[PDB]
């Protein structure tokens, strides 16, 4: 496992797009813990349980916790955008619909290893990209 | 009398830590083979652990493993230790607590290694393992498969809902092969085995450091599951017969347990080493 | 990778400049491990993840681990100076702005081959120059 | 009859030290080619290892390799040992555990070396290799390529360089070329192979020395992956036919394993030597 | 018939011992020209190598090279060998494995030496080389340069000195100049060529002597990278037409390989001599 600079760029763009990094290049402190907990849940419980937990918006948490799932979808979409025709025959290169539920997308597409690898890549990229910024 | 195959049966979880900075979930990962990416024990670590076990017998360690790092003279090691490649990994199921998981490519690598290195009892093992491999390939016809050799273990979920077991009632599993590879044996396609043996599916253990009852650190550790089987080759050099016999007798007794890897004080990596039984 | 004396002097000046060496020629003992581990992190994780890890200032480290990234940038900038400027030279003798963090610079300027070589040599110079001082 | 090509099939991870002070992460580096910067074995190391294997047959080593370093008389060696250049290297894949990677520039170098030296079976190999290379150049049309010759390996990924191998249906792979270049063979551009074979992508292993459980040292070793293939030329001088025939028979016997490089006691650098098969 | 230029075109790594006192690390260093500090082979070395190749032809050796040492007949040699100067050297690149590096000063020295010796069929070569050099100087305009002659090879990186090779689309390279100076040819300043061929940049190899696993001795050797091109002038005195013809044909035959250098048994210094062609 080695995270590419392109993945970090996608993570930065997605964090800015789903209103996580402010215009002052700062983020709420709880999102680092959110991302670490998501990684731990993914490895321990599974993709479906972790994505279902962090896709919730009725959660009374201290911040908009679904934003990391939105950033995940944005990173995966950007990754699938740069897929080659050689890759498109083996990998599912389709862009994940924006309104579509990420957990529902995973479930309807089985539980393929491709989605798990993409989720793990994007989670580590989110971790590093958040580490690049300051936490106020 | 020169080359021997030894099976490592781990009585607890094993962590042979690689020197790796993973910035994802698992802070400490285990060593993986440079080619097949399967968990393995580096020959240096195995030699160090076995030398540590025999440290009391100065003569045996000096003649078989070589001289100590701090010595005016250096003595070349006589016995050659090869890296311990993974053979069988327990996989969680629904019908049974755990099955012994092997892959067709792992079996191919084992047959190739036995052919190349000429183990002591290699001929019959090579013949029967080969025959089993052609039978499995004939049945599979390219598609992914999970083949058990007990009719009771049919439809078993091999750690994943996608991987379901079926019993091919044409492939006999000989008793000696069962002894070598494990009691409840499932042979998987390489795709299935690599899915089951990757960094997202290997067992992980959570650890934290407390300061006066309050947590200071938190990290995740990757371990090789308990009762896993790894095989390594031992080459007798020009070593003395007496020391070699003592070493083999001590290594292959049921009361000998060797610590391999990290976290010795908390029980990680206690193993039993068994010589390749005649077929 | 032979010892480059000029890079050693650059490392000395940068270590003094980024408040690592005290007026008495001593440094916090943990910085030895920081310098030693940075090279391994670059080799076996990637340059961007290693830089992001060592540039973070929200760390639970015994000292200011981010000072080593500033020293690295100072050594790299000193090497960009005294570059033989000619039409055929591959090396970009453009100095890294102080306002830009090191992680951003490699992200925005996507020629990592020069940056990777410079960062590796600067880290070696760092480790070799840290030994002139007391390891308190 | 003078010049024959021998292929080195490594059974373990090989480390041939270069004696270069790195001052960086990887203190111990492996030897690399003078011109192509590919991993290689110096002919001195090859000669020393093969002499060490044949040290029991004192007459044969005196006749072929020459006199011992301490000997009142000096006798020049009759056999010419050429440096072993990397032919194919194992690269991590997803469909299969690993692929046999070769670059078009490595193939061009092989063709050039066979033309210059005129190996025993050079003509047919040069013809078929040139046809393969011309077909590859026609198919690629100057772009970056990754071509596999089994239709089942289409879309196989190279892990270090995140590309997937295509299947050019127009190009045949002759069985003797498969036996020479390795099974599950992928041919890719020089850029891809150079990235795959640089210092950052070769297997680097962490090692330490423990003193009463406390770590005394820490260093990193890089190795050439197991199952790598290397080729070298063997030119016989006015060597006696009897000793030459015994040498070839013992060297190419499947029971013969030669240790080239360092870390012998931990099973590093064990290889098999085979001749160029008739096409 | 009076003076012919010959090109060496080494197939392996050359080590010609300078035999001089050492101030430094490398115990064995290669010969260099006193004035230009460029790698060179002494005329004595060339004569010895070619004489050893033709030793089985007693009459040819006696007629061309003369009497053997400690022979009482005292026969001088009818052929005069001139010092071999380094023409082109391989240089690491990124687009291609290596590049053929010829410096403008070596080209000027080649033109000057061709005019001085009045080499056979050298008039057209001198004229075209002078046109090439004049066009190069016109394009350079006094600045350091790196010029390639293939549109594919434009933008190649010389790793050691970090200069990008541009393609001058206004200068022609005639086919005979490609045959002489080499394939994948880059022309750069002597400032860069001196750095590329100094003692810190050309390959240095560590060599060992082991005694039952104990390192008896240690030293370092430096070698000239393979595929290097060196040129020397042969003054064929008015000798027998038949022996001169046989020697020229044997030298030019692509089946010939001549060992000039030290480490013969480990394949150092094997070369293919070719004479100047028309144009």
PDB file of N, CA, C and O in Angstrom, chain C residues 84 89, chain E residues 32 36-39 86 89-92 101 103 106 144 158-163 188-203 222 225:
ATOM      1  N   UNK C  84      23.986  25.561 -11.268  1.00  0.00           N
ATOM      2  CA  UNK C  84      24.521  26.086 -12.518  1.00  0.00           C
ATOM      3  C   UNK C  84      23.374  26.288 -13.499  1.00  0.00           C
ATOM      4  O   UNK C  84      22.844  25.322 -14.056  1.00  0.00           O
ATOM      5  N   UNK C  89      20.174  22.222 -18.244  1.00  0.00           N
ATOM      6  CA  UNK C  89      20.090  21.656 -16.903  1.00  0.00           C
ATOM      7  C   UNK C  89      18.659  21.241 -16.577  1.00  0.00           C
ATOM      8  O   UNK C  89      17.712  22.005 -16.786  1.00  0.00           O
TER       9      UNK C  89
ATOM     10  N   UNK E  32      44.972   5.800 -17.880  1.00  0.00           N
ATOM     11  CA  UNK E  32      44.446   7.055 -18.389  1.00  0.00           C
ATOM     12  C   UNK E  32      45.550   7.796 -19.127  1.00  0.00           C
ATOM     13  O   UNK E  32      46.731   7.663 -18.799  1.00  0.00           O
ATOM     14  N   UNK E  36      45.270  14.255 -21.248  1.00  0.00           N
ATOM     15  CA  UNK E  36      43.830  14.485 -21.235  1.00  0.00           C
ATOM     16  C   UNK E  36      43.119  13.817 -20.066  1.00  0.00           C
ATOM     17  O   UNK E  36      41.939  14.110 -19.838  1.00  0.00           O
ATOM     18  N   UNK E  37      43.801  12.943 -19.325  1.00  0.00           N
ATOM     19  CA  UNK E  37      43.205  12.203 -18.209  1.00  0.00           C
ATOM     20  C   UNK E  37      41.969  11.426 -18.658  1.00  0.00           C
ATOM     21  O   UNK E  37      41.003  11.261 -17.913  1.00  0.00           O
ATOM     22  N   UNK E  38      42.005  10.943 -19.894  1.00  0.00           N
ATOM     23  CA  UNK E  38      40.936  10.126 -20.436  1.00  0.00           C
ATOM     24  C   UNK E  38      41.370   8.666 -20.482  1.00  0.00           C
ATOM     25  O   UNK E  38      42.555   8.377 -20.670  1.00  0.00           O
ATOM     26  N   UNK E  39      40.443   7.726 -20.298  1.00  0.00           N
ATOM     27  CA  UNK E  39      40.828   6.309 -20.304  1.00  0.00           C
ATOM     28  C   UNK E  39      41.475   5.915 -21.623  1.00  0.00           C
ATOM     29  O   UNK E  39      41.042   6.330 -22.700  1.00  0.00           O
ATOM     30  N   UNK E  86      39.952   6.754 -25.888  1.00  0.00           N
ATOM     31  CA  UNK E  86      38.528   6.532 -25.686  1.00  0.00           C
ATOM     32  C   UNK E  86      37.731   7.427 -26.623  1.00  0.00           C
ATOM     33  O   UNK E  86      37.832   8.656 -26.556  1.00  0.00           O
ATOM     34  N   UNK E  89      31.753   6.489 -24.872  1.00  0.00           N
ATOM     35  CA  UNK E  89      31.529   5.747 -23.647  1.00  0.00           C
ATOM     36  C   UNK E  89      30.036   5.684 -23.357  1.00  0.00           C
ATOM     37  O   UNK E  89      29.308   6.645 -23.632  1.00  0.00           O
ATOM     38  N   UNK E  90      29.549   4.568 -22.823  1.00  0.00           N
ATOM     39  CA  UNK E  90      28.129   4.486 -22.467  1.00  0.00           C
ATOM     40  C   UNK E  90      27.817   5.353 -21.259  1.00  0.00           C
ATOM     41  O   UNK E  90      28.605   5.450 -20.315  1.00  0.00           O
ATOM     42  N   UNK E  91      26.649   5.984 -21.296  1.00  0.00           N
ATOM     43  CA  UNK E  91      26.225   6.910 -20.255  1.00  0.00           C
ATOM     44  C   UNK E  91      24.781   6.599 -19.891  1.00  0.00           C
ATOM     45  O   UNK E  91      23.936   6.440 -20.776  1.00  0.00           O
ATOM     46  N   UNK E  92      24.502   6.512 -18.592  1.00  0.00           N
ATOM     47  CA  UNK E  92      23.164   6.171 -18.132  1.00  0.00           C
ATOM     48  C   UNK E  92      22.153   7.221 -18.574  1.00  0.00           C
ATOM     49  O   UNK E  92      22.397   8.425 -18.467  1.00  0.00           O
ATOM     50  N   UNK E 101      28.161   8.529 -25.565  1.00  0.00           N
ATOM     51  CA  UNK E 101      28.635   9.871 -25.253  1.00  0.00           C
ATOM     52  C   UNK E 101      29.951  10.120 -25.979  1.00  0.00           C
ATOM     53  O   UNK E 101      30.950   9.442 -25.722  1.00  0.00           O
ATOM     54  N   UNK E 103      32.362  13.525 -26.829  1.00  0.00           N
ATOM     55  CA  UNK E 103      32.539  14.937 -26.534  1.00  0.00           C
ATOM     56  C   UNK E 103      33.130  15.659 -27.736  1.00  0.00           C
ATOM     57  O   UNK E 103      33.798  15.057 -28.583  1.00  0.00           O
ATOM     58  N   UNK E 106      36.908  15.288 -28.010  1.00  0.00           N
ATOM     59  CA  UNK E 106      37.354  14.011 -28.559  1.00  0.00           C
ATOM     60  C   UNK E 106      37.135  13.972 -30.067  1.00  0.00           C
ATOM     61  O   UNK E 106      37.941  13.398 -30.805  1.00  0.00           O
ATOM     62  N   UNK E 144      27.120  25.290 -23.091  1.00  0.00           N
ATOM     63  CA  UNK E 144      27.180  23.845 -22.926  1.00  0.00           C
ATOM     64  C   UNK E 144      25.980  23.191 -23.598  1.00  0.00           C
ATOM     65  O   UNK E 144      24.874  23.738 -23.615  1.00  0.00           O
ATOM     66  N   UNK E 158      20.927  12.613 -18.963  1.00  0.00           N
ATOM     67  CA  UNK E 158      22.190  12.047 -18.504  1.00  0.00           C
ATOM     68  C   UNK E 158      22.192  12.144 -16.982  1.00  0.00           C
ATOM     69  O   UNK E 158      22.312  13.236 -16.421  1.00  0.00           O
ATOM     70  N   UNK E 159      22.042  11.000 -16.314  1.00  0.00           N
ATOM     71  CA  UNK E 159      21.736  11.000 -14.885  1.00  0.00           C
ATOM     72  C   UNK E 159      22.863  11.612 -14.063  1.00  0.00           C
ATOM     73  O   UNK E 159      22.609  12.361 -13.112  1.00  0.00           O
ATOM     74  N   UNK E 160      24.113  11.303 -14.407  1.00  0.00           N
ATOM     75  CA  UNK E 160      25.231  11.669 -13.543  1.00  0.00           C
ATOM     76  C   UNK E 160      25.417  13.179 -13.453  1.00  0.00           C
ATOM     77  O   UNK E 160      25.695  13.708 -12.371  1.00  0.00           O
ATOM     78  N   UNK E 161      25.268  13.893 -14.567  1.00  0.00           N
ATOM     79  CA  UNK E 161      25.499  15.333 -14.594  1.00  0.00           C
ATOM     80  C   UNK E 161      24.220  16.129 -14.789  1.00  0.00           C
ATOM     81  O   UNK E 161      24.268  17.366 -14.763  1.00  0.00           O
ATOM     82  N   UNK E 162      23.081  15.462 -14.983  1.00  0.00           N
ATOM     83  CA  UNK E 162      21.763  16.101 -15.023  1.00  0.00           C
ATOM     84  C   UNK E 162      21.680  17.165 -16.121  1.00  0.00           C
ATOM     85  O   UNK E 162      21.526  18.359 -15.859  1.00  0.00           O
ATOM     86  N   UNK E 163      21.783  16.709 -17.367  1.00  0.00           N
ATOM     87  CA  UNK E 163      21.616  17.566 -18.533  1.00  0.00           C
ATOM     88  C   UNK E 163      20.672  16.882 -19.512  1.00  0.00           C
ATOM     89  O   UNK E 163      20.743  15.665 -19.712  1.00  0.00           O
ATOM     90  N   UNK E 188      28.160  15.996 -26.292  1.00  0.00           N
ATOM     91  CA  UNK E 188      28.142  16.905 -25.159  1.00  0.00           C
ATOM     92  C   UNK E 188      29.511  17.555 -25.002  1.00  0.00           C
ATOM     93  O   UNK E 188      30.481  17.183 -25.664  1.00  0.00           O
ATOM     94  N   UNK E 189      29.575  18.545 -24.120  1.00  0.00           N
ATOM     95  CA  UNK E 189      30.824  19.247 -23.874  1.00  0.00           C
ATOM     96  C   UNK E 189      31.820  18.342 -23.157  1.00  0.00           C
ATOM     97  O   UNK E 189      31.447  17.416 -22.434  1.00  0.00           O
ATOM     98  N   UNK E 190      33.108  18.620 -23.372  1.00  0.00           N
ATOM     99  CA  UNK E 190      34.150  17.886 -22.664  1.00  0.00           C
ATOM    100  C   UNK E 190      34.084  18.111 -21.162  1.00  0.00           C
ATOM    101  O   UNK E 190      34.579  17.277 -20.399  1.00  0.00           O
ATOM    102  N   UNK E 191      33.484  19.220 -20.726  1.00  0.00           N
ATOM    103  CA  UNK E 191      33.300  19.461 -19.299  1.00  0.00           C
ATOM    104  C   UNK E 191      32.468  18.359 -18.660  1.00  0.00           C
ATOM    105  O   UNK E 191      32.798  17.868 -17.575  1.00  0.00           O
ATOM    106  N   UNK E 192      31.385  17.952 -19.322  1.00  0.00           N
ATOM    107  CA  UNK E 192      30.556  16.869 -18.808  1.00  0.00           C
ATOM    108  C   UNK E 192      31.217  15.511 -19.018  1.00  0.00           C
ATOM    109  O   UNK E 192      31.108  14.624 -18.164  1.00  0.00           O
ATOM    110  N   UNK E 193      31.908  15.336 -20.147  1.00  0.00           N
ATOM    111  CA  UNK E 193      32.545  14.058 -20.445  1.00  0.00           C
ATOM    112  C   UNK E 193      33.663  13.740 -19.459  1.00  0.00           C
ATOM    113  O   UNK E 193      33.881  12.569 -19.129  1.00  0.00           O
ATOM    114  N   UNK E 194      34.384  14.759 -18.990  1.00  0.00           N
ATOM    115  CA  UNK E 194      35.413  14.535 -17.980  1.00  0.00           C
ATOM    116  C   UNK E 194      34.804  14.046 -16.673  1.00  0.00           C
ATOM    117  O   UNK E 194      35.355  13.152 -16.021  1.00  0.00           O
ATOM    118  N   UNK E 195      33.669  14.624 -16.274  1.00  0.00           N
ATOM    119  CA  UNK E 195      32.984  14.168 -15.069  1.00  0.00           C
ATOM    120  C   UNK E 195      32.464  12.749 -15.254  1.00  0.00           C
ATOM    121  O   UNK E 195      32.493  11.935 -14.325  1.00  0.00           O
ATOM    122  N   UNK E 196      31.988  12.427 -16.458  1.00  0.00           N
ATOM    123  CA  UNK E 196      31.406  11.113 -16.700  1.00  0.00           C
ATOM    124  C   UNK E 196      32.449  10.003 -16.733  1.00  0.00           C
ATOM    125  O   UNK E 196      32.087   8.829 -16.609  1.00  0.00           O
ATOM    126  N   UNK E 197      33.731  10.338 -16.891  1.00  0.00           N
ATOM    127  CA  UNK E 197      34.778   9.332 -17.029  1.00  0.00           C
ATOM    128  C   UNK E 197      35.864   9.461 -15.967  1.00  0.00           C
ATOM    129  O   UNK E 197      36.952   8.900 -16.132  1.00  0.00           O
ATOM    130  N   UNK E 198      35.602  10.182 -14.880  1.00  0.00           N
ATOM    131  CA  UNK E 198      36.600  10.324 -13.831  1.00  0.00           C
ATOM    132  C   UNK E 198      36.534   9.136 -12.872  1.00  0.00           C
ATOM    133  O   UNK E 198      35.740   8.207 -13.040  1.00  0.00           O
ATOM    134  N   UNK E 199      37.385   9.166 -11.845  1.00  0.00           N
ATOM    135  CA  UNK E 199      37.481   8.039 -10.925  1.00  0.00           C
ATOM    136  C   UNK E 199      36.289   7.948  -9.982  1.00  0.00           C
ATOM    137  O   UNK E 199      36.090   6.901  -9.359  1.00  0.00           O
ATOM    138  N   UNK E 200      35.500   9.010  -9.858  1.00  0.00           N
ATOM    139  CA  UNK E 200      34.328   8.993  -8.996  1.00  0.00           C
ATOM    140  C   UNK E 200      33.066   8.519  -9.704  1.00  0.00           C
ATOM    141  O   UNK E 200      32.069   8.238  -9.031  1.00  0.00           O
ATOM    142  N   UNK E 201      33.080   8.415 -11.032  1.00  0.00           N
ATOM    143  CA  UNK E 201      31.877   8.088 -11.783  1.00  0.00           C
ATOM    144  C   UNK E 201      31.940   6.762 -12.526  1.00  0.00           C
ATOM    145  O   UNK E 201      30.906   6.107 -12.662  1.00  0.00           O
ATOM    146  N   UNK E 202      33.106   6.348 -13.010  1.00  0.00           N
ATOM    147  CA  UNK E 202      33.131   5.069 -13.700  1.00  0.00           C
ATOM    148  C   UNK E 202      33.163   3.923 -12.686  1.00  0.00           C
ATOM    149  O   UNK E 202      33.654   4.093 -11.567  1.00  0.00           O
ATOM    150  N   UNK E 203      32.646   2.749 -13.058  1.00  0.00           N
ATOM    151  CA  UNK E 203      32.291   1.740 -12.050  1.00  0.00           C
ATOM    152  C   UNK E 203      33.469   1.298 -11.193  1.00  0.00           C
ATOM    153  O   UNK E 203      34.587   1.112 -11.677  1.00  0.00           O
ATOM    154  N   UNK E 222      38.351  -0.842 -10.286  1.00  0.00           N
ATOM    155  CA  UNK E 222      37.591   0.031 -11.165  1.00  0.00           C
ATOM    156  C   UNK E 222      37.711  -0.482 -12.594  1.00  0.00           C
ATOM    157  O   UNK E 222      38.761  -0.999 -12.992  1.00  0.00           O
ATOM    158  N   UNK E 225      33.176   0.799 -18.452  1.00  0.00           N
ATOM    159  CA  UNK E 225      31.875   0.194 -18.763  1.00  0.00           C
ATOM    160  C   UNK E 225      31.873  -0.467 -20.132  1.00  0.00           C
ATOM    161  O   UNK E 225      32.508   0.010 -21.074  1.00  0.00           O
TER     162      UNK E 225
END
